[PDB]
Amino acid sequence: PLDVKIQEIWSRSANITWTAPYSSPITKYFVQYWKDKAGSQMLQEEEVTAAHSSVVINNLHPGTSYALTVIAENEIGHGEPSETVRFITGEEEPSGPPTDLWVESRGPFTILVRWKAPPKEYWHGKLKGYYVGYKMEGSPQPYSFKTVEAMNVNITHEYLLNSLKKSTKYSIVVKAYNAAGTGPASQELIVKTLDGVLPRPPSVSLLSASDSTISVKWGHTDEPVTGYTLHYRKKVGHWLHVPLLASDQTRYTLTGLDSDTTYNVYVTANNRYGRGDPSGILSVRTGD
Amino acid sequence: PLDVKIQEIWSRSANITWTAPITKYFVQYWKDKAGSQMLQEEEVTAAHSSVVINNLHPGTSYALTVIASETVRFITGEEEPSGPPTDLWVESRGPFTILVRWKAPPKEYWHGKLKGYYVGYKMEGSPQPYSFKTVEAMNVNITHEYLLNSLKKSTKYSIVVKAYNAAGTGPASQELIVKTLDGVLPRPPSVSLLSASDSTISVKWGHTDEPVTGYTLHYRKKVGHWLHVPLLASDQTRYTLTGLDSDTTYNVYVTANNRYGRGDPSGILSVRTGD
Ligand code: NA
Ligand code: NA
Ligand code: NA
């Protein structure tokens, strides 16, 4: 038919509109529609009598791009007017929370939150951003929320909470949102700010591994650091402790290890007031 | 701290237990996944021989240490999956059968290792409850499938799939409404991509019960109108489109026709030409 229009759109429905085409008279109207993404899709079809200039398509997925064609079939079945349109269905609120919530850095006044986006299939509409809420753990007050950009092209998302109190436990949640509304919140993350007295946790990273050895490095930490302690253990085994008197030290190579064995490794910094909070704990398998 | 014990486990909690022959007790715990994790810590009095850790993730494996030293491992209790299966795909393969396929929900939403899936189906046009069938989890595989059979012909069915684990059942996928074939008109060919070039696209489909009199190949640009290539030849089972534009996305699908008329279409392909 000529002048095919999507007259109105819902999140799961769309009303299609056209005008009577060139007439051999029209036997029926044939409506095809399918998802407009890459890869093979289902070709949905639906008939309408020649007396109708309209139809409502139902059971569509929200926030999804569709292509649709109306065909005016003929007696002759030849040269039958066709026209294809493209549209996107209305939005619905995200149905899944962000995942893999993660603390990256910490200070006495700041907390760096990171998270991965909920899977695209649960967006039901392109995300407009995220809400990061936080509160002190033992407080009746509600969460106070901060707005973050969606950055939908990035794998990782992050936000730095600041102007916090020292040595305080905060509860953190993240929600995604789009034009329709807000999705569910992630599970509570309970994070304690530093004290500003003990050393900050080092940033430990894997340097090298072999059949018998593992090497790791970390950045120097901020009252003068008097030393570091490296901790390690087999996945089935007790913790062992390598004391590093040297504060020039930012590297260490474990030796005499077992082949094809997973070791855990983390580092702590010490100053005159005692041992600071630990790094992330690494999982490294002995190899080449 | 001798003989550390996980005395009991919940889905987000765990009670830890020990004896010790001291300043304080120091309780470290972390997720037992690969890659760098967060080392969570809590302190407890010297007067306590036990502590309850809170706000753990369900269906998650943890390692734990108590220091006055000794490290144990456990897995938190299960919770029901919180997401439905994705990428639902059903084609009426016959007048009596429908083959359903789906991808698993993202593992972050399992909250416990999946035991399988439930495939529910019912006639659309009459008020009925869904009748559910059990399928194995096959968590190793990327794609999952179930062939619904013993159906009526030329009937519309409503299809849903759910994941489930030891805690219970996850939410269902949105309805897929699919109609079984009539057993008269040709069954929809199964068309797949062979090759693409800057100027061409080549596709294939399966060979043949009533003798097929011909095929029609339909194609169009992502922005454009449908074009129809009639193939009265029923022998070859392949075709190569020519004269296309470079770096352009084309839709393609194939219909078969016999004495009774034109059969239901293929799946619709989306193929982009090379540079
Ligand atoms: Na068209
Ligand atoms: Na501290
Ligand atoms: Na065109």
Author numbering:
A (entry chain B): 297 to 319, 322 to 519, 523 to 589
B (entry chain A): 297 to 317, 324 to 370, 380 to 519, 523 to 589
What does the paper say about this structure?
We evaluated the cis polymerization of sDscam FNIII domains on living cell surface and determined the crystal structure of sDscam homo cis-dimer. Thus, this kink conformation may reflect a physiological geometric assembly. The inter-domain interface of the kink contains a salt bridge formed by R404 and D578, and the hydrophobic interaction mediated by L492 and L496. The dimer interface buries 2109 Å2 of surface area, which is composed of one FNIII2-FNIII2 interface, two FNIII1-FNIII2 interfaces and two FNIII1-FNIII3 interfaces. Consistent with our cellular data, FNIII2 played a pivotal role in sDscam cis recognition as it formed intermolecular interactions with FNIII1 and FNIII2 of the other protomer and intramolecular interactions with FNIII3 of the same protomer. The FNIII2-FNIII2 interface was located at the center of the cis homodimer, where P395, P417 and Y420 formed a hydrophobic core. Y420 appeared to be essential because it formed a hydrogen bond with P395 and π–π interactions with the symmetry-related Y420. The FNIII1-FNIII2 interface was dominated by hydrogen bond networks formed by the side-chain of N357 and Q485, and the main-chain of L358 and E486. In contrast, the FNIII1-FNIII3 interface was composed of both hydrophobic and hydrophilic interactions. To verify the cis-dimer interfaces, we made single-site mutations on the FNIII1-FNIII2 interface (N357A and Q485A) and the FNIII2-FNIII2 interface (Y420A). Evaluated by the cKIT tyrosine phosphorylation assay, all the mutants significantly reduced the cis-interaction.
Recently, a shortened Dscam (sDscam) gene family with tandemly arrayed 5′ cassettes in Chelicerata species has been identified, which encodes ∼50–100 isoforms. Chelicerata sDscams could be classified into two subfamilies, sDscamα and sDscamβ, containing one and two variable Ig domains, respectively. Crystal structures and cell aggregation assays demonstrated that both α and β subfamilies of sDscam used Ig1 for the isoform-specific trans recognition in a hand-in-hand manner. Furthermore, the cis interactions were established by the three FNIII domains of sDscam, which assemble into a cross fold with a kink between FNIII2 and FNIII3.
